[PDB]
Design a protein around this motif. Structure first.
Motif, PDB file in Angstrom:
ATOM      1  N   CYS F  26      30.601 -64.438  -5.206  1.00 27.22           N
ATOM      2  CA  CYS F  26      30.129 -63.152  -4.634  1.00 27.22           C
ATOM      3  C   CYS F  26      31.309 -62.220  -4.462  1.00 27.22           C
ATOM      4  O   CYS F  26      31.190 -61.017  -4.782  1.00 27.22           O
ATOM      5  N   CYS F  29      32.809 -59.699  -7.300  1.00 28.00           N
ATOM      6  CA  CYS F  29      32.238 -58.339  -7.437  1.00 28.00           C
ATOM      7  C   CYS F  29      32.161 -57.614  -6.118  1.00 28.00           C
ATOM      8  O   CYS F  29      32.275 -56.361  -6.139  1.00 28.00           O
ATOM      9  N   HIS F  30      31.976 -58.365  -5.001  1.00 25.77           N
ATOM     10  CA  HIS F  30      31.970 -57.782  -3.665  1.00 25.77           C
ATOM     11  C   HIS F  30      33.300 -58.115  -2.926  1.00 25.77           C
ATOM     12  O   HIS F  30      33.370 -58.917  -1.989  1.00 25.77           O
ATOM     13  N   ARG F  60      23.930 -51.276 -13.358  1.00 23.04           N
ATOM     14  CA  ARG F  60      24.068 -50.564 -12.095  1.00 23.04           C
ATOM     15  C   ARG F  60      25.408 -50.879 -11.442  1.00 23.04           C
ATOM     16  O   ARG F  60      25.952 -51.953 -11.625  1.00 23.04           O
ATOM     17  N   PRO F  63      27.134 -52.350  -5.214  1.00 23.23           N
ATOM     18  CA  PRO F  63      27.192 -51.664  -3.926  1.00 23.23           C
ATOM     19  C   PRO F  63      27.978 -52.474  -2.929  1.00 23.23           C
ATOM     20  O   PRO F  63      28.085 -53.726  -3.034  1.00 23.23           O
ATOM     21  N   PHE F  87      19.016 -54.232  -3.119  1.00 23.74           N
ATOM     22  CA  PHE F  87      19.211 -53.643  -4.470  1.00 23.74           C
ATOM     23  C   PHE F  87      18.905 -52.163  -4.478  1.00 23.74           C
ATOM     24  O   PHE F  87      18.193 -51.655  -3.603  1.00 23.74           O
ATOM     25  N   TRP F  88      19.428 -51.480  -5.496  1.00 24.22           N
ATOM     26  CA  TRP F  88      19.250 -50.031  -5.558  1.00 24.22           C
ATOM     27  C   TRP F  88      17.758 -49.670  -5.755  1.00 24.22           C
ATOM     28  O   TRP F  88      17.382 -48.556  -5.397  1.00 24.22           O
ATOM     29  N   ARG F  91      13.983 -54.103  -5.002  1.00 23.19           N
ATOM     30  CA  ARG F  91      13.085 -55.176  -5.519  1.00 23.19           C
ATOM     31  C   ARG F  91      13.250 -56.507  -4.751  1.00 23.19           C
ATOM     32  O   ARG F  91      12.428 -57.404  -4.936  1.00 23.19           O
ATOM     33  N   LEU F  95      17.972 -59.658   2.752  1.00 25.64           N
ATOM     34  CA  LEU F  95      19.206 -60.351   2.291  1.00 25.64           C
ATOM     35  C   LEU F  95      18.874 -61.767   1.778  1.00 25.64           C
ATOM     36  O   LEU F  95      19.414 -62.193   0.739  1.00 25.64           O
ATOM     37  N   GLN F  98      17.430 -61.675  -1.591  1.00 35.24           N
ATOM     38  CA  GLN F  98      18.446 -61.213  -2.533  1.00 35.24           C
ATOM     39  C   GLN F  98      19.410 -62.297  -2.992  1.00 35.24           C
ATOM     40  O   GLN F  98      19.723 -62.343  -4.186  1.00 35.24           O
ATOM     41  N   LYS F 260      17.201 -46.358  -3.546  1.00 35.79           N
ATOM     42  CA  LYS F 260      17.476 -46.438  -2.092  1.00 35.79           C
ATOM     43  C   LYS F 260      18.652 -45.550  -1.649  1.00 35.79           C
ATOM     44  O   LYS F 260      19.719 -45.565  -2.323  1.00 35.79           O
TER      45      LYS F 260
HETATM   46  C1  HEC Z   1      29.028 -59.653 -11.602  1.00 35.73           C
HETATM   47  C2  HEC Z   1      28.995 -58.897 -10.275  1.00 35.73           C
HETATM   48  C3  HEC Z   1      28.240 -59.482  -9.085  1.00 35.73           C
HETATM   49  C4  HEC Z   1      28.278 -60.736  -8.477  1.00 35.73           C
HETATM   50  C5  HEC Z   1      29.080 -61.938  -8.814  1.00 35.73           C
HETATM   51  C6  HEC Z   1      27.363 -60.573  -7.314  1.00 35.73           C
HETATM   52  N1  HEC Z   1      26.901 -59.335  -7.157  1.00 35.73           N
HETATM   53 FE1  HEC Z   1      25.774 -58.613  -5.561  1.00 35.73          FE
HETATM   54  N2  HEC Z   1      25.435 -56.883  -6.581  1.00 35.73           N
HETATM   55  C7  HEC Z   1      25.817 -56.629  -7.836  1.00 35.73           C
HETATM   56  C8  HEC Z   1      25.208 -55.437  -8.411  1.00 35.73           C
HETATM   57  C9  HEC Z   1      25.496 -54.880  -9.792  1.00 35.73           C
HETATM   58  C10 HEC Z   1      24.237 -55.031  -7.469  1.00 35.73           C
HETATM   59  C11 HEC Z   1      23.254 -53.878  -7.583  1.00 35.73           C
HETATM   60  C12 HEC Z   1      22.212 -54.427  -8.599  1.00 35.73           C
HETATM   61  C13 HEC Z   1      20.885 -53.666  -8.580  1.00 35.73           C
HETATM   62  O1  HEC Z   1      20.704 -52.812  -7.699  1.00 35.73           O
HETATM   63  O2  HEC Z   1      19.979 -53.974  -9.375  1.00 35.73           O
HETATM   64  C14 HEC Z   1      24.434 -55.962  -6.357  1.00 35.73           C
HETATM   65  C15 HEC Z   1      23.694 -55.878  -5.105  1.00 35.73           C
HETATM   66  C16 HEC Z   1      23.788 -56.827  -4.009  1.00 35.73           C
HETATM   67  C17 HEC Z   1      23.050 -56.627  -2.715  1.00 35.73           C
HETATM   68  C18 HEC Z   1      22.119 -55.446  -2.378  1.00 35.73           C
HETATM   69  C19 HEC Z   1      22.914 -54.507  -1.438  1.00 35.73           C
HETATM   70  C20 HEC Z   1      22.245 -53.133  -1.402  1.00 35.73           C
HETATM   71  O3  HEC Z   1      22.668 -52.236  -0.651  1.00 35.73           O
HETATM   72  O4  HEC Z   1      21.325 -52.890  -2.180  1.00 35.73           O
HETATM   73  C21 HEC Z   1      23.366 -57.735  -1.990  1.00 35.73           C
HETATM   74  C22 HEC Z   1      22.897 -58.049  -0.598  1.00 35.73           C
HETATM   75  C23 HEC Z   1      24.307 -58.561  -2.870  1.00 35.73           C
HETATM   76  N3  HEC Z   1      24.592 -57.933  -4.017  1.00 35.73           N
HETATM   77  C24 HEC Z   1      24.915 -59.826  -2.435  1.00 35.73           C
HETATM   78  C25 HEC Z   1      25.569 -60.745  -3.372  1.00 35.73           C
HETATM   79  C26 HEC Z   1      25.868 -62.139  -3.031  1.00 35.73           C
HETATM   80  C27 HEC Z   1      25.483 -62.760  -1.682  1.00 35.73           C
HETATM   81  C28 HEC Z   1      26.426 -62.667  -4.175  1.00 35.73           C
HETATM   82  C29 HEC Z   1      26.918 -64.067  -4.476  1.00 35.73           C
HETATM   83  C30 HEC Z   1      25.684 -64.965  -4.394  1.00 35.73           C
HETATM   84  C31 HEC Z   1      26.476 -61.541  -5.097  1.00 35.73           C
HETATM   85  N4  HEC Z   1      26.041 -60.369  -4.576  1.00 35.73           N
HETATM   86  C32 HEC Z   1      27.139 -61.662  -6.368  1.00 35.73           C
HETATM   87  C33 HEC Z   1      26.894 -57.340  -8.512  1.00 35.73           C
HETATM   88  C34 HEC Z   1      27.288 -58.695  -8.244  1.00 35.73           C
END
Ligand code: HEC
Ligand code: HEC
Ligand code: HEC
Ligand code: HEC
Ligand SMILES: [Ca+2]
Ligand SMILES: [Ca+2]
Ligand code: NA
Ligand code: NA
Ligand code: NA
Ligand code: NA
Lengths: 126, 354, 376, 376, 125, 354
Positions: F26, F29-30, F60, F63, F87-88, F91, F95, F98, F260
C-alpha cells in the motif's frame, strides 16, 4: 380630518386635497410634480379624455364642470395624493367614474398614470 | 346712428333689387324662417344654393347668419392657429368685408359691378334718405362709397339681438330657469368630456359669457366631396376645395382642407351639414366622428348611403390628435348628443324640431 | 410666507375672474441654473425608481425622470443635458435584462438618446455617484462593471453608441479628468490613472499607496471635476485630498474634520453622501454625529464646515433633522442641501449660517443621492 | 403568545446547539387550502405592483407574485392555479406596451404560462375583481376592455393562447356561469347574458331591467361562481341578489342591509371591496359606517352580517380599524378578512364573533384586493 | 431605537433587525416574505455569491461567520427592511461590503434583489 | 480489536509480500512521506501509478489516504444526491470494502486470488501470531476469512490518528493558537464566500466538528481526458471514464462523469491534481475554475500547456449552477487561495512547502 365627514371645498391652496376643483380627483395633483393646476409636468403626455364632476367654488358661489384629464407616460408621481368622489358614479356611468385611467388620446399612446389636472371646462347645468 | 344704421341694413337684407334680375335678396338664401339658411331645393337638394340667374349653384352650403356677429375678426393667434373671419374658409376678415361679396358674385346675386349696385340704391327714395342721413350727401352717387355704406349697414343689422337672441333651452337652463331632461343632461355631459369640446366650445378652459359652441379655429376633419353638389357647381371633377388655403395671403400648405368650426347653435334646424351639405341628418354628422375611433365595420359606412364615407377631399392636415380620441360613441351617446344639440335651438325655431 | 399652492390658487382665481383663457399643455422646466438640484430615490432596491428635479431657490419640484433598478444619474456641469445608466427586465424583476443609457433634454426632459449596453454590464450596487461618470467635455459616459471582474465601459454620447469595455486592475469608482483619462481607487490603497485610446489595453499607472489598509475610505467621496479635487473622508473623518488638476495625482496634506477630543467622545461621520465640496470657496462639509464605530451608514444631525487648505473648522451646524446626504450648490452664497432618507425630504439650508430655509417632502420611498451642476 | 419570529429563533438556536445541518434552498409554499388568502396591492397606480400570498390561519406571508400596471388577479376555486392579466412597458412607464396573462403554480409560484394579449387590449382601472374572471372549468380567462368600446377578450388557458375579442353592448364586469357563458351589467339596468362557446359571433340576450337609474350599484359586488349568487349592493346598502344557478338570471327582492334607524342616522356602506358572501353559510357581510353621501370610497369601521335567505341581521361588528375591503374564507367556521389600505395591514377576524385574531402588516403601498378560493 | 448607539444583538426573534445573525444584513429578512432564516421564498432564485460578517451570538458568547446570500428575481419584498453594518467595509473590500447586490450565481441570471438569508458558515477565528 | 487491530494493519500496509512479485505494498503508492500519494514517475509522469508487474498503469491518480476515514459510507441522501464511499467513483462502500481490491487488481498488486493472499500471510510467523490473536486459530487457512481479516486490519489502521491528525496551520488558527498571515486570511475569506465553499466544505451551514473540506458529494466539473495518462492505462482512445455511473447498481445517466469531491487537506503536497492527474500545479487547478466565469482569453488556456483546456471527457451533467458563479478570481485572489490551501497541510508536511 374625519375621512367620512362631508367634504368642504376651499379656494386658497391648490396643493391641498380640499381645493375646490379637486372635488372628484383620484391620483395626484400635477402641480406637485412640476405641472401646474391645468398643465402637465415636462416629459409626460396630456390625455384628451377625462371624467368630470360639478364642483362648487366657494370663491364665487358657482358650480363648474371640471375635466380631470390625466398626464400620462410616467410612473405615479407620489406627491400630493388625493381621492375625492363628489358626484362620482360607478364604472357603468364612465363619464362620472374616477377609478379609470383617463389617458386616452395622450400622445405616443401613453397610458400609465402620473397625475391629474383640474381645468374648468364649462358651467354645471345643476 | 346705431339703431338707424341697423334699420337701414334690415331694409337692404330683404331687398331683391340688390340682385341683377331682381329675384333674390340676402334673405332668399339666408331665410329668417329657417335660422337664416336656404330652404330651397336645387340640383343637389339643399346642399348648395342657386343664384339670381336661376341656374348657377354654389359649391358650399349656405351657413346660418345667427351668432355670426360673435366671431372675432380674422387673425393668427400666438400659437400659429388661424381664428375668426367669415365664410367657411375665412377669406373675409369680418361681416363688413363679407357683405358686398354675394352682391357681386355671378353665381349668387350677380350684380356686374359696384356702379350697378349704386344705381339700384339711387332708384329708391327711401335709400337716398336713409343712406344720406347716415353717410352724408351724395353717398349714393359714388359707387365706392355706396357699396361700402351698404356693407356697413348689413353688418350692423347682423349684429342685432335678432340674429343672436341667446334664448335656447340651453340658455334658459344656464340661467337656472329650467332643467335639462336626463337624456339632454347626459348629452351635455358627453359633449363636454368627449372630443367635441376640443373644437365646439369657445374657450380651452374657463367659461364663455356668450358661448356659441365653436372656438373659431380651422380644422380639416377629412370630409369627402359631396358629389351631387360638386357636379351642380360646375367646378369640375378635378376641383379641390382647399378651404382656408384659398384665403389670399394664406400660403402655408398645412392650412389646405381646413374649414372654420361652425357654431352649433340652431344646428338641429340647419341641415344638411358640413361645408358642402354632404349629410342630411344631424345624427349622421355625429356618427361621422366614429370613423376615427370605432373598430366596428358599420363605423366606415355613411348610414344615409350604405356606402363608405368616402376618401377625404383633402387627405392631409387632418386633425388626428383631436379626432383619434380612442373612444367610440355608442348609439345611446349618439342619442344623447342629438338631444343636447336640439337644446341649442333659438326659441323661435323650436316648432321646427318636428 | 405665502406657499406655492396658495400663490397658485390666487393666480388661478384671478384668471377665472378675468375670463383669461390658456391652453392645457405640457410645461417646460425652467432653464438649468446653479440652484437646480436633483434627488435620486433608489427606493431601497425597488425594481423601478425616480429622480426629482428641484428648483432649490423656490423649493419646488420642476420635473421627474423614471428609472429602473439602481440607476446611476449624471448631470452635465454646463447644464446642457442629464443622463443615467439604468436596468430593466422584461417581467418587472425577472426575465431578460436590458441595461442602457438615456440622455435627456434638461428642459423638456425628453430622452434624446437611448443607448443599449450589451451583455447587461452594469454594476448593481446601492447608488454611488462616482460609479458612473461623464468626461469633462460631456461626450463620453464611463460606467463601472464588477462582474466578472472590475472593468470600465465606454459609451459615446455624441455618436449614441456603446464603444467597448476596458480591462482595469482590482479598482473602484471612476473620476474622469480628460476625454481619454480617469482615475480609480484600488484595493491596494493606490489610485490608478487609466488612459485609453480607441483600441488596446489602457495605459495604467499607479500612485503610491496613500492610506493604510485599516483606514477605510467611504463609498461617497466628493469630486469636483472642474477643480480636479478629490475629497475622500475615512470612517473617522480624516479627510484625504487629491489634486488631479495637473493631470497626475498629487496628494495634499490630510486634515481632520473632528478634534481628538470629539473623536474620543464618539464623534464620527455617518450617512450616505457624507461629504460635500464647494469649489469657489474651497470648503468641505461633512455630516457627523456621535455614534458607535460600526453605525457608519446611519443618519447624522450635524454638519461641520472646514477650510480645505488649512483644515480650520469654520462652522458646526445643528441640522435639526436625521440627515443622510449632503451636497451644495456651486454659486456664490451657496445653498447647503440636506437629504433625509427616512423623512423622504430634502431640507434646503443657507450654507453660511446653516439656517433651514425651506424643504421639499414626498421624495419617493428612500431618497439618497443629491446632484448639482457646477455651472460657474 | 409566541410569535412566528420567536418560534423560528428558538428552532435555529436548537439546530445550532445540536449541530443540525439543512440545505439553503427555495421553499415551496404550503399546499393551497381554504385559509390561504391573497392580497393585491395596486400601489395607488404605480407602474409595478405586488400580490401577497398569506396563510390566514398562521397570519404568515407564504409567498409573493410581482405584477405590472393595475393587474387583475384571479384564483382558481379548486386551488389548482392562480393567474393574472398584467401590463408592462419597455421603459418603466413609457415606450412599447405589452399586456399578457401569466398562470402560476400555486406552490412553487413559478409561471407555467405567459400568454401575450395582442394590441394592448386590457382595461386600465383601479382594481375590480370581476373585470377579469375564470370560467368554472378553469380553462378560459375573460378580461374586460373599455376602449374604443366595451368588449371582452377570451384567453384559452389550456392551449395557452389569446383567442379573440367579443363585441358586447354598453355593459361592464364579467360573471362567468358556465364554460361558455358569462353575464355583464349594462348601463340600461339590465344584465346581458353572453354565450360565447364558439369562434362565431356570441349570442347576447338581455334580462329585464332590475334597478332604477338613480340607484348606484357599486364597482365591487360579491359573486360566488359555485353558488351562482351575485350579491350587488347600492350606495345606500340596498342589496340586489341575483340567482344565476339555473343558467338564467332570477332577481330576488332587494333588501336593506342597514336598518331604518341606521339609514336615518347617516349609515351607508363605503370602502373598496364593501361586500363578501359565504356560500355554505349563505351569509352576506357589508362594510358600513356613518358618512356623507359622497364619501363612498372611504374606509369603514363596521361590518354588518345578514342571512341572505331571510334578510335577517345576524351581527354588527366594530372592526377597530379603518377597513377598505373585506372577504371571507369559504370553509365551515370562516375567517373574516379586513384589509386596511391606509395601514397596509390585513386584519384577520373570527367571522362568527367578529373578534380580531391576528394581522399581517407591511403589505405594500396601498393594498386593496382580497381573494380566496372556494375549495369545498 | 437610537440609530447611532452600538447595536445590541438578541437571540429571540429572527424577524427583528437586532437578531444576532443580521449584524451586517442589508435589505429585507427573507423569513418575512415566505422564505425562512436560511431559505428563499418560492419563485425567487438563491444566489451563490455572499458578503460575510463575524456576528456575536449573545446566547453562547461566540462569534460566527454569517455569509449572507440573496434571494433574487423579484422586486424587493418591502417586509422587515433592515440595514446593519457590523465590521462592514467599503466597496474596495467587496467580501465585507453590503451595498452590493450579491445575486451572482442565481439561476436564470436573476439579479434583482428580493431579500437576504442569514446562514452560518463557520466559527469566527 | 482496536489498538492491536490497527497495529496489524500497520504491518500489512508497508509489506510488499501482499503483491504478486513482492515489489509493492500500500505504502509504495500511498507513500506516508508524501501525504500517502505516489512519488514514482511512470509513463505519464506522476498522473497515474504503476502496478507490481512494473508495466501496468492505472487510469486514475492515486489519492491521499489522509482523512479518508472521515468519509461516510456510500449512500443516497434524501435529496437524491449520492455521498461518501471510497475511490474517485464511490464504487467501494467504505474503507473495509476498499482494502482488498488493490491486492487482487492485476493493474495494482496483482495477487491471483484470495487463496494466494492467504498463502502469503501464512508464510510469515508474525502474521500467524497477530491474525490468530485477533481472529482465532486457523484464520489464515481459510482464504475468505484471511482476506476479510486483512481488509479489516487495513481499514482500522487508516482510521487512526496518524492518518487524520488535524494539526495543520488551519487547525491551529481555528484553536486560537496563532493567526493567519494577511494573505492566508484573505484566501480563507474568498474560499468561504466564493463558489469553493459549495462543494469543499463538510456542511451546508453551521460549523463542522472535523472539517475536511469536502461535502463528499459527486460532481462533474468538466475535466478533459489526460491524454498521456489515458495512453499509458491502455484503456483505449474511445474509452470514457463515467465516474460514479461506473459503480455497480448506479444506473441513473445523470451520474455519468461525476467524481467524489476530494478533501483539500494536504492538497499543496499531493500533486498532480484531479481524478486523472491532469494538472501538475495547484495554481493551475484553481485557475481551471475561471474557465466558467472569466471572458478573458487567458481563462481558456491551460497555463501548463499554452493550449486550450480541452473539451470535457463527459460533456453532460456538469455542475454549471455552482461553477458559473458570475465572478472570476483575479491573480490576487488566486494567490490568496493558494496561501489558504497551503495552511491545510498537516504539520509533518510543512517542510515540503518549499
Ligand atoms: C499501484 C498503486 C496502488 C497500490 C499499491 C494501492 N493503491 Fe490505493 N489507490 C490507488 C489508486 C490509483 C486509487 C484511485 C483508484 C480509483 O479511484 O479508481 C486508490 C484509492 C484508494 C482509496 C480510496 C481513497 C479515496 O479518497 O477515494 C483507499 C482507501 C486506498 N486506495 C487504500 C489502499 C490500500 C489499503 C492499499 C494496499 C492494500 C492500496 N491502496 C494499494 C493506487 C494504489
Ligand atoms: C345664392 C345664395 C346666397 C345669397 C343671396 C347670399 N348668401 Fe350669404 N352665404 C351663402 C353661401 C353659399 C355662403 C358660404 C360661402 C362660402 O363659405 O364660400 C354664405 C356665407 C355668408 C356669411 C358667412 C357666415 C359664416 O359663418 O362664415 C355671411 C356673413 C353672409 N353669407 C351674409 C350674406 C349677406 C349679408 C347677403 C346679402 C348681401 C348674403 N349673404 C347673400 C349664400 C348666399
Ligand atoms: C377637431 C375639431 C373638431 C372636433 C373634435 C369635432 N368637431 Fe364638429 N366640426 C368641426 C368642423 C371644422 C366642422 C365643419 C367641418 C366642415 O364642414 O368642413 C364641424 C361640423 C360639425 C357639425 C355640422 C355643423 C354644420 O352646421 O354643418 C356637427 C353637428 C358637429 N360638428 C358636431 C360635433 C360633435 C357632436 C363632436 C364630438 C363627437 C364634434 N363635432 C367634434 C370641428 C370638430
Ligand atoms: C461544483 C462543486 C465544486 C466547486 C464549486 C469547486 N470544486 Fe474543487 N473539486 C470538485 C471536484 C468534484 C473535484 C474532483 C474533480 C475530478 O477530479 O474529477 C475537485 C477538485 C479540486 C482540486 C484538486 C484536489 C485533488 O486532490 O486533486 C482543488 C485544488 C480544488 N478542487 C479547489 C477548488 C477551489 C479553490 C474552488 C473554488 C474556486 C473549487 N475547487 C470549487 C468540486 C468543486
Ligand atoms: Ca347647413
Ligand atoms: Ca493528486
Ligand atoms: Na349629395
Ligand atoms: Na391663399
Ligand atoms: Na498528461
Ligand atoms: Na453502474
Amino acid at each position: 380630518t374625519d375621512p367620512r365627514a362631508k367634504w368642504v371645498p376651499q379656494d386658497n391652496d391648490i396643493q391641498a386635497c380640499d381645493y375646490w376643483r379637486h372635488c372628484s380627483i383620484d391620483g395626484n395633483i400635477c402641480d406637485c410634480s412640476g405641472g401646474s393646476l391645468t398643465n402637465c409636468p415636462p416629459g409626460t403626455k396630456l390625455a384628451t379624455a377625462s371624467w368630470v364632476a360639478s364642483c362648487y367654488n366657494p370663491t364665487d358661489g358657482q358650480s363648474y364642470l371640471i375635466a380631470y384629464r390625466d398626464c400620462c407616460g410616467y410612473n405615479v408621481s407620489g406627491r400630493c395624493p388625493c381621492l375625492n368622489t363628489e358626484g362620482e358614479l360607478p364604472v357603468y356611468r364612465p363619464e362620472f367614474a374616477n377609478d379609470i385611467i383617463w389617458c386616452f388620446g395622450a400622445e405616443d399612446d401613453a397610458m400609465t398614470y402620473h397625475c391629474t389636472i383640474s381645468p374648468i371646462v364649462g358651467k354645471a347645468s345643476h | 346712428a346705431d339703431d338707424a344704421l341697423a334699420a337701414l341694413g334690415a331694409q337692404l337684407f330683404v331687398d331683391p333689387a340688390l340682385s341683377r334680375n331682381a329675384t333674390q335678396s340676402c334673405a332668399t338664401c339666408h331665410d329668417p324662417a329657417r335660422a337664416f339658411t336656404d330652404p330651397r331645393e336645387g340640383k343637389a337638394g339643399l346642399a348648395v344654393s342657386v343664384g339670381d340667374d336661376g341656374q348657377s349653384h354654389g359649391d358650399r352650403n349656405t351657413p346660418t347668419l345667427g351668432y355670426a356677429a360673435l366671431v372675432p375678426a380674422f387673425h393668427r393667434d400666438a400659437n400659429g392657429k388661424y381664428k375668426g373671419g367669415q365664410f367657411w374658409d375665412g377669406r373675409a376678415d369680418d361681416l363688413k368685408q363679407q357683405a358686398g361679396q354675394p352682391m357681386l358674385n355671378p353665381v349668387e346675386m350677380a350684380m356686374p359691378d359696384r356702379a350697378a349696385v349704386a344705381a339700384r340704391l339711387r332708384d329708391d327714395p327711401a335709400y337716398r334718405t336713409g343712406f344720406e342721413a347716415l353717410f352724408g350727401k351724395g353717398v349714393l352717387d359714388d359707387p365706392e362709397r355706396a357699396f361700402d355704406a351698404a356693407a356697413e349697414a348689413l353688418a350692423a343689422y347682423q349684429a342685432t339681438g335678432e340674429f343672436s337672441p341667446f334664448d335656447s333651452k340651453y340658455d334658459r337652463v344656464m340661467r337656472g330657469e329650467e332643467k335639462f331632461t336626463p337624456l339632454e343632461e347626459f348629452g351635455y355631459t358627453v359633449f363636454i368630456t368627449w372630443n367635441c369640446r376640443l373644437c365646439h366650445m369657445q374657450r380651452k378652459q374657463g367659461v364663455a359669457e356668450r358661448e356659441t359652441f365653436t372656438n373659431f379655429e380651422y380644422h380639416n376633419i377629412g370630409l369627402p366631396v359631396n358629389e351631387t353638389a360638386r357636379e351642380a357647381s360646375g367646378l369640375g371633377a378635378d376641383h379641390v376645395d382647399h378651404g382656408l388655403l384659398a384665403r389670399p395671403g394664406i400660403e402655408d400648405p398645412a392650412q389646405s382642407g381646413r374649414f372654420k368650426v361652425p357654431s352649433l347653435r340652431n344646428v338641429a334646424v340647419t341641415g344638411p351639414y358640413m361645408h358642402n351639405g354632404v349629410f342630411t341628418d344631424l345624427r349622421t354628422a355625429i356618427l361621422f366622428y366614429n370613423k376615427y375611433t370605432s373598430r366596428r365595420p358599420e363605423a366606415k359606412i355613411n348610414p344615409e348611403t350604405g356606402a363608405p364615407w368616402g376618401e377625404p377631399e383633402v387627405a392631409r392636415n387632418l386633425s388626428l390628435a383631436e379626432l383619434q380620441s380612442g373612444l367610440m360613441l355608442d348609439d345611446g351617446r349618439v342619442d344623447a348628443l342629438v338631444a343636447f344639440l336640439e337644446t341649442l335651438t333659438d326659441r323661435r325655431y323650436e316648432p321646427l324640431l318636428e | 410666507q405665502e406657499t406655492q399652492g396658495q400663490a397658485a390658487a390666487r393666480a388661478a382665481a384671478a384668471d377665472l375672474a378675468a375670463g383669461q383663457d390658456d391652453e392645457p399643455r405640457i410645461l417646460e422646466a425652467p432653464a438649468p441654473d446653479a440652484r437646480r438640484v436633483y434627488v435620486n430615490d433608489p427606493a431601497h432596491f425597488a425594481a423601478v425608481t425616480q429622480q426629482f428635479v428641484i428648483d432649490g431657490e423656490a423649493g419646488r419640484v420642476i420635473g421627474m425622470i423614471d428609472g429602473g433598478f439602481l440607476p446611476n444619474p449624471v448631470v452635465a456641469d454646463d447644464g446642457s443635458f442629464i443622463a443615467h445608466a439604468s436596468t430593466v427586465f422584461s417581467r418587472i424583476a425577472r426575465g431578460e435584462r436590458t441595461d442602457y443609457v438615456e440622455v435627456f433634454d434638461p428642459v423638456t426632459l425628453l430622452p434624446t438618446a437611448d443607448i443599449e449596453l450589451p451583455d447587461a454590464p452594469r454594476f448593481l450596487v446601492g447608488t454611488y455617484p462616482w460609479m458612473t461618470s461623464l468626461t469633462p467635455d460631456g461626450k463620453t459616459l464611463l460606467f463601472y462593471q464588477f462582474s466578472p471582474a472590475p472593468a470600465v465601459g465606454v459609451v459615446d454620447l455624441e455618436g449614441k453608441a456603446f464603444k467597448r469595455m476596458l480591462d482595469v486592475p482590482d479598482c473602484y469608482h471612476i473620476f474622469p479628468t480628460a476625454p481619454d483619462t480617469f482615475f480609480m481607487h484600488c484595493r491596494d490603497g493606490s489610485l490608478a490613472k487609466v488612459a485609453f485610446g480607441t483600441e488596446g489595453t489602457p495605459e495604467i499607472t499607479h500612485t503610491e499607496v496613500f492610506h493604510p489598509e485599516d483606514e477605510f475610505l467611504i463609498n461617497h467621496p466628493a469630486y469636483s471635476q472642474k477643480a480636479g479635487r478629490l475629497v475622500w473622508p475615512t470612517y473617522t473623518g480624516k479627510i484625504h485630498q487629491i489634486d488631479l488638476s495637473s493631470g497626475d495625482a498629487k496628494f495634499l496634506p490630510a486634515v481632520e474634520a473632528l478634534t481628538e477630543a470629539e473623536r474620543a467622545d464618539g464623534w464620527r461621520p455617518g450617512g450616505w453622501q457624507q461629504v460635500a465640496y464647494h469649489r469657489a470657496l474651497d470648503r468641505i462639509y461633512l455630516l457627523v454625529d456621535q455614534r458607535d464605530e460600526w453605525r457608519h451608514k446611519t443618519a447624522s444631525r450635524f454638519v461641520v464646515v472646514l477650510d480645505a487648505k488649512t483644515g480650520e473648522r469654520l462652522a458646526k451646524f445643528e441640522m435639526g433633522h436625521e440627515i443622510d446626504s449632503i451636497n451644495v450648490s456651486q454659486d456664490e452664497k451657496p445653498l447647503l442641501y440636506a437629504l433625509s432618507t427616512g423623512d423622504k425630504t430634502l431640507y434646503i439650508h443657507d450654507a453660511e449660517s446653516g439656517e433651514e430655509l425651506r424643504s421639499v417632502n414626498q421624495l419617493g420611498h428612500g431618497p439618497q443621492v443629491i446632484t448639482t451642476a457646477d455651472m460657474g
